[PDB]
# Entry
Amino acid sequence: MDIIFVCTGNTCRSPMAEALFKSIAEREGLNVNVRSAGVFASPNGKATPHAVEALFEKHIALNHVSSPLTEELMESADLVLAMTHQHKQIIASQFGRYRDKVFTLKEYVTGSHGDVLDPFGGSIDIYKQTRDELEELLRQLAKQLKKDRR
# Structure
């Protein structure tokens, strides 16, 4: 199992979800890899001064530098977890409808298309609201994985 969290510019939430899921997987004794990318990210984007601070408040000390989602990473991974249906369709448009590997961030857990709070460019409080929702989701995501590590 290798998971790619994906949002347009990566930094918006994907590395928060990565850091949380690593921490939660370590709590649960799950065995995975998780990474993050963006359909229009670049190899020199990084964790925002509020995402990183929100996970420092979580006492995880996030540190991440972005990269684009490209087909070799897609082929290497076993799950893709996209923040929106629009992102899912961009991924499909990049990779010739490799869409089967992709699920939306709520969808993989709720069973229905949707997203968490998008904090991109908000104050620390918005990333704080996000990481609470994101943790609650990712605990259910760990519950979903423990079925088959998928």
